[PDB]
Structure formats: structure tokens, C-alpha cells
């Protein structure tokens, strides 16, 4: 889209409706007259448009009312309220801008942020943007978290997030103007290569693939159209339904072979009763002819009875001769009907070994952009975040995605190598207890008004707990943690000295020996200028390739490359990096999935901030002290960088509302 409306969509808001959030801040407008809603709705869109059209400098309120034109730059609090709401919840002046009004003189309130992952940094920036004392605690020796870039000499390769789903409503679009990233597109063409070393010919490549997309919809039909959603009082996984659909196909391939060879018998057995009727007419005829011959041996002149005998046996033998001609006229039509039915013989199979092995690779791709065995994704909900996807060609960051956390981190109080160990939150404040990661003996106490926790869902899941909560996290939140999915997928970095792959090809597959190893080294990326091939490991395989040395794994890679490019044309790698994300204690996985039994609504619990009990019993209900952001916390954008980033902008906007007050609602 384009116009004032173009901003509204690039900002993820419907240009002609007030959003449920805006209703809560402007509940005078949305309850009132259709006119004022439209006034407002322009002022919102219009300001979004300004910030978007130049995201490298702050958009002061003055600057906005300036470029407004009447009747809209008439009511100069409807413009105020709108602007501040926008600025508060990071719909404008988020990311990295030159601040026209340099920072407030004195800080107000103290916020400790656990994690300098993307959500962390994004809220830290927004909170300090609002004039608070923000300090971030990071267990790692680097910022970014799950956004890990490997750098050695000229080599560059993310072990972390890599893709950027398209800049169609992506907040990352804004960031990329603010930070010099090298956004190349992903050329979608992917040739597959079975364990031999030779390409799967278009022929198959496309008829497997389409059968795979076809199977998927079939599950969605199982889910939504038939309510196949509980199987012996457990919920139904995607991988479950994807087999009750593959079985019902193999089944109907048999029902159809059966009722076709059953057409043959029902007619071949008509032939059995026509051949029997025919042979017992050739017997009557063989015998009448003998009789009629005997009746003509009588030498004339004969009396009339023995003359009526000839004339009679003649009509009788002409009558039977007519019958037997008709009844092999009919032998004609059936005897060809029956090469007819042996010449449209319906299909021999549902899929072959070569077939449901290539299909196994199209499943290992779901197991990659979900990071989990399809047997754990929820059938009704696996794809629930699809309706919101950004319009655009996915992209890759060529200078390394780590360029973006580092850019954000700048200007922020970040305590690196600081493992948070216990969060204590009370009616009157919180203290966070950390150790130094290097010598774990050495202890740190941090006091603050509120703690924003961006601890990865894998960490939050640890039994027994990497981080202790005092008091405990309430059941509604702990159960939302157990239910949700945290999954795994790892990358192998292959650094060579010359491109020996198809350089115009960004990526190419490898098909798996088994069903059970559809994941193991199932896909390669040449995304980078340098000679760096990058090797995915998803599915059930990811979790077990973390029990195998780096050598064994580069071996399995080169072998799979030798077969595909020539035992000689594939040298040694100069540098090798094997990720271990389920291993890594500051993540305990890769991102969230919607587990069977989870809904998208656990993702919303994940965010409800926690309010502690009153100190002095029967005190006023306190202000909510513990907050949550991160990839896991954003229903409509899980498991992505833009999604974390958005949750950070969010909590900041809510904390600011809690401690700096919300003046924009009168």
C-alpha cells in the first residue's frame, strides 16, 4: 500500500479502524462520533508516515504539528495525545535516532533488564529513551543472544537468526535504514540431491513437493473441517495428522486397485457364462446337423411327415445357428471390454521409496522453520502466526546480523559476564542477584523498581532452575512455561578457499537415507560473498548431532558434498563452527514452537507481568514489579527477531506507563 495508509500498514495497524490498544488510550474518541474517529485515525497515520519517511532523526511533537494541515492541526492536544502514545509504545522514535531534545537531566525510577538479547536491548533503549535508569545484566561476553555472528578474518556467518522475513510491515525495515545492513534477497531455487549424488529431476522435484503441500492442506482440513483434534485424550500433533492423511491415501490407492480388478472379474465371469452357453449350443447344433443329415438321406419321393422332418430340422438348425451367432457377437464386445480394463489399471503405489524419501526432505523443512519434530507441533495451532506475515521476499544479512544488536546496545549500561541467579520482587521493590560467570564465587546484588526478564523460554524451563524466583512464579505462569514449545536447530559453518558450488544458487538440499534422519545435514547455504557454505541440522536430528564431535560432523558434511560435487572438487575447510543451541545454557534451545496442548494464548500469558503480594498485610494492591519480553512473549510474531524487538518496545511502553505515569489519556 501507499499514502497515509501506507504508514498504517507498514506500522502493522489497520488505517481505518481504531485498534484495541488505541481504544484503551483514547476511549473518548472511539465511543464518540464517527467524525472524530476519522480525524484521529488520520493524525495517527499521518504521524506514523512522518517517522517512517525519515527514521534516522527523532520526530518531536513540534515537528509533527508543523507538517500537519488543518482541520487536523487544529486540535493541538488530539495531536499531542496521539504523538505521545505513538512515541511511548515505540511506533515512532524507536531504534537508533538522533535525539533532537537531548536526554532528560535526571533519571526517574530504576529498571534492571535480564538479558541483552534483542528484546532486552530494544526495551533498554526505549526505557532510557524515556529517561529511566536502565541497566542490563548479561550472562554472556557479548550482546545479541540468539543473534550470534561468527567472525574470523574475512569470514562471516550467523549461527543465529539469518533470514529477515520481508520488509512488508516489518519493524526491521525501520532498523535497516537506521543501521547499515547488507540485505541480499534469498533466491528461492533449491535443487535436491539424493544420497547417491545426483539431482532429483524436475519431474519428481515438483510432483513430490506438490504432494507435500497437498498433504499439509489435508491436515488443515482434518483440523478445521472435521475436528480431528483429540486422539485418546491427548491432543493431535501435525506429524500425527500428516500420517493419518498419508495412510488414508495409501488406503484409497488400495480401495481403487480393488474395485478395478473387481470390475475385471465381474465381466470376466460374464464371459464364463457366455462361453458355457455357447459351448452347449455348439453341442445342440453339432447334433441337429447330424439329425438333419439323416433326414435328407431318406431318398425322395417321401411322404409328407418325412418331408416335414427335413423342413423342420432345417428351421430348427437355422434358429440355433442364429442364437449362436448373436451369442458370439456378444462374446465379441466383452472380450475387448476386458483389454479395456487391463489398459486403464489405476496406480500401482501411493509413493515409492524414492518418493516418500524426497517427501521426507520436504518434512525436514517444516522441522527447520519450526525447529521441532512435527510430532510435537500442535495440529490446530502450529501455523496460527501465519496470518500476520510480512509481505516481501525474505532476505539475508551479508555483513552479519550481529551488526544490529551491537548497534542497539550502544549507549546502554550493560554488565557482561553476569549470570543472574535469583530474582526477588516485593511490594516495595526488587533485588536481582547475579554472579560473575568467570569466577562464580563473586556475587552481585542489584536493587530496582522493576525487573524486565528477557530470559529465553528454554532457560525459564530448566529443572532445576538456572534462575530462582522469590517469591515463586505463580502456577498460571509456570504452567504456561511447561506447555509451550522450545525447540532446537543447529548450523555448521564450512569455510573454504574457493566456491565449488553453483554460485548463482543460494541454497541446495540433500535427501536423507531414512525417515529417521530426514534432518541430518539436510540443506546448505551459500549466502555470503566469501567461500562459506552453511549446513542446517533440524528435526529429530538436531538434538542428537549435539552428542557427536565437531570432526565427525564436518566429515558427514564433506562426504555429502563429495557425492554432490565430486570426490576431488571439495577441499578441506579452513575454519569449522558447529553450533549447540540445546547445549548452550543461556538458551537451552533455539526458539519456541506451539506445542500440541499449547495454544497461541500461552504466548499471551508469557507476557502478563507479575504483581507481588502486599508487604504490610492489608496494604494497597501494589504496582506490578516483574515484566516479561522476548521471542516467546509475542503471540503474533514468535520465534523471530522482529518479534522479540517488538516485545521489547512493548514492555518498555508499559513500564513507562507504570512508573512515569500515562499523561496521554485525558
Amino acid at each position: 500500500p501507499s499514502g497515509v495508509e501506507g504508514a498504517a500498514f507498514q506500522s502493522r495497524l489497520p488505517h481505518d479502524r481504531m485498534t484495541s490498544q488505541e481504544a484503551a488510550c483514547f476511549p473518548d474518541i472511539i465511543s464518540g462520533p464517527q467524525q472524530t474517529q476519522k480525524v484521529f485515525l488520520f493524525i495517527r497515520n499521518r504521524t506514523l508516515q512522518l517517522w517512517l519517511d525519515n527514521p534516522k532523526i527523532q520526530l518531536t511533537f513540534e515537528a509533527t504539528l508543523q507538517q500537519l494541515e488543518a482541520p487536523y492541526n487544529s486540535d493541538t492536544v488530539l495531536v499531542h495525545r496521539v504523538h505521545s502514545y505513538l512515541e511511548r509504545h515505540g511506533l515512532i522514535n524507536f531504534g537508533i535516532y538522533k535525539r533532537i531534545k537531548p536526554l532528560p537531566t535526571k533519571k526517574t525510577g530504576k529498571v534492571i533488564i535480564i538479558g541483552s538479547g534483542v528484546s532486552g536491548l530494544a526495551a533498554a533503549r526505549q526505557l532510557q529513551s524515556f529517561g529511566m535508569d536502565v541497566t542490563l545484566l548479561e550472562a554472556r561476553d557479548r550482546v545479541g543472544g540468539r543473534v550470534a555472528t561468527f567472525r574470523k578474518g574475512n569470514y562471516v556467518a550467523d549461527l543465529g537468526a539469518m533470514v529477515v522475513t520481508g520488509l512488508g510491515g516489518n519493524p526491521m525495515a525501520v532498523v535497516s535504514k537506521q543501521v547499515n545492513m547488507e540485505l541480499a534477497k534469498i533466491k528461492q531455487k533449491c535443487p535436491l540431491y539424493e544420497a547417491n549424488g545426483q539431482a532429483v529431476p524436475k519431474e519428481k522435484d515438483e510432483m513430490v513437493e506438490q504432494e507435500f503441500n497437498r498433504l499439509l492442506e489435508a491436515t488443515s482440513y482434518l483440523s478445521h473441517q472435521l475436528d480431528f483434534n483429540v486422539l485418546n485424550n491427548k491432543p493431535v500433533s501435525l506429524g500425527q495428522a500428516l500420517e493419518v492423511v498419508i495412510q488414508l491415501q495409501e488406503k484409497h490407492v488400495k480401495d481403487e486397485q480393488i474395485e478395478h480388478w473387481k470390475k475385471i472379474v465381474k465381466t470376466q465371469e460374464e464371459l464364463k457364462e457366455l462361453l458355457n452357453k455357447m459351448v452347449n449350443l455348439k453341442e445342440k447344433i453339432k447334433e441337429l446337423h447330424q439329425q438333419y443329415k439323416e433326414a435328407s438321406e431318406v431318398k425322395p419321393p417321401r411322404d409328407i411327415t418325412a418331408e416335414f422332418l427335413v423342413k423342420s430340422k432345417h428351421r430348427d438348425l437355422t434358429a440355433l445357428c442364429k442364437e449362436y451367432d448373436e451369442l458370439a457377437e456378444t462374446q465379441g464386445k466383452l472380450e475387448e471390454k476386458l483389454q479395456e480394463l487391463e489398459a486403464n489399471p489405476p496406480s500401482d503405489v501411493y509413493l515409492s521409496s524414492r518418493d516418500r524419501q524426497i517427501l521426507d526432505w520436504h518434512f525436514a523443512n517444516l522441522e527447520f522453520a519450526n525447529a521441532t519434530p512435527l510430532s510435537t507441533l500442535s495440529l490446530k495451532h502450529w501455523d496460527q502466526d501465519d496470518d500476520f506475515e510480512f509481505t516481501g521476499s525474505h532476505l539475508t544479512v551479508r555483513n552479519g546480523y550481529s551488526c544490529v544488536p551491537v548497534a542497539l546496545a550502544e549507549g546502554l549500561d550493560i554488565k557482561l559476564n553476569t549470570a543472574v541467579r535469583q530474582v526477588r520482587y516485593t511490594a516495595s521493590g526488587c533485588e536481582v542477584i547475579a554472579v560473575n560467570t568467570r569466577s562464580t564465587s563473586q556475587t552481585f546484588i542489584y536493587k530496582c523498581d522493576a525487573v524486565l526478564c528477557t530470559l529465553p523460554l528454554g532457560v525459564l524451563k530448566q529443572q532445576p532452575p538456572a534462575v530462582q524466583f522469590v517469591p515463586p512464579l505463580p502456577e498460571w505462569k509456570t504452567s504456561a512455561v511447561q506447555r509451550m514449545g522450545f525447540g532446537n536447530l543447529n548450523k555448521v559453518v564450512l569455510c573454504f578457499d574457493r566456491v565449488f558450488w553453483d554460485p548463482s544458487v543460494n541454497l541446495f538440499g540433500h535427501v536423507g537415507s531414512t525417515t529417521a534422519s530426514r534432518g541430518e545435514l539436510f540443506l546448505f547455504w551459500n549466502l555470503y560473498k566469501a567461500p562459506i557454505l552453511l549446513a542446517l541440522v533440524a528435526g529429530e536430528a538436531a538434538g542428537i548431532m549435539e552428542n557427536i564431535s565437531d570432526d565427525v560432523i564436518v566429515g558427514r558434511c564433506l562426504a555429502i558434498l563429495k557425492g554432490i560435487f565430486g570426490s576431488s572438487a571439495v577441499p578441506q575447510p579452513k575454519e569449522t563452527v558447529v553450533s549447540r543451541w540445546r547445549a548452550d545454557p543461556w538458551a537451552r534451545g533455539s526458539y519456541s514452537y506451539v506445542a500440541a496442548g499449547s495454544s497461541g494464548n500461552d504466548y499471551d500469558l508469557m507476557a502478563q507481568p507479575i504483581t507481588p503480594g502486599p508487604s504490610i498485610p492489608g496494604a494497597p494492591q501494589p504496582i506490578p514489579r516483574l515484566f516479561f519480553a522476548g521471542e516467546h512473549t509475542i503471540r503474533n510474531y514468535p520465534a523471530t527477531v522482529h518479534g522479540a524487538l517488538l516485545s521489547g518496545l512493548r514492555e518498555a511502553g508499559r513500564i513507562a506507563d507504570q512508573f512515569l505515569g500515562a499523561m496521554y489519556t485525558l
Partner: protein, 133 residues
């Protein structure tokens, strides 16, 4: 609203592959055999019919009699009358056979015969005895 065309997902179908753990692998053997069963019964009858096909060797052609293309007349020769009266005793009302036995009397001349002569040839008595039979 409807499964992707080419995919067979019926309500009834689904509950049969999910009724237990191997109810999948069950249903696809009572089919897999089902077939081998009908396949057998084909080669059986495909053989029963191969032997019946060979008994009909020669066809009915050392058994045909040529065509009596004799032109249809009008008069009832005292001979043709007698062939008729027996034609009735052996054929009854099949009016076609009687007219092929006499050879030169149209089926309709056979009616006039049935009526004009009747009584004189007791075509009643003759006919009732064809029915005993």
C-alpha cells in the same frame, strides 16, 4: 470446505485408521490381501475361460446350411397345407417358425390359414395338444 481434490478424507475413513495403534496397519493388510484374493480368482476364471474358448474351436461352420431364398407365393398347395398342419402340431403359435418351415408363405398368410381352414383342419384340437407339451 472440501479436501484438496485427489485427497480422500472421509469422516468414516478416519476413525478406522485411528481406532488403535495398528488399526492403520490392519486396514492396509485386509486390503493388501483382499487384492491378492481377487487377483487369484482372475487367473482362475481367466483359465476356465481359456479352456471353454478352445472347445468352441471351429465355431458353427461345418454346421451351417445355405439360404433358402425362395420367393413368397400365394396359393396353398395341398402339400404346403400338410406341412402347415404339422408345423402347428410341432410349433403351436410361433407363426415365424411355421412360415420358415413352409418357406414360401409369409407370416400373414399363416394367419388366414389359421382361420380360413381351422375347422377343416381341426386347428383347435391340433393346437390344444401342442400345449400338452
Amino acid at each position: 470446505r472440501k479436501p484438496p481434490k485427489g485427497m480422500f478424507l472421509s469422516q468414516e475413513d478416519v476413525e478406522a485408521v485411528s481406532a488403535n495403534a495398528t488399526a492403520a496397519t490392519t486396514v492396509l493388510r485386509q486390503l493388501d490381501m483382499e487384492l491378492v484374493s481377487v487377483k487369484r480368482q482372475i487367473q482362475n476364471i481367466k483359465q476356465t475361460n481359456s479352456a471353454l474358448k478352445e472347445k468352441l474351436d471351429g465355431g458353427i461352420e461345418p454346421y451351417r446350411l445355405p439360404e433358402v431364398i425362395q420367393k413368397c407365393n400365394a396359393r396353398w398347395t395341398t402339400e404346403e397345407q400338410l406341412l402347415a398342419v404339422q408345423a402347428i402340431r410341432k410349433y403351436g403359435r410361433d407363426f415365424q417358425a411355421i412360415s420358415d418351415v413352409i418357406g414360401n408363405k409369409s407370416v400373414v398368410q399363416v394367419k388366414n390359414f389359421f382361420v380360413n381352414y381351422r375347422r377343416r383342419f381341426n386347428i383347435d384340437e391340433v393346437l390344444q395338444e401342442w400345449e400338452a407339451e
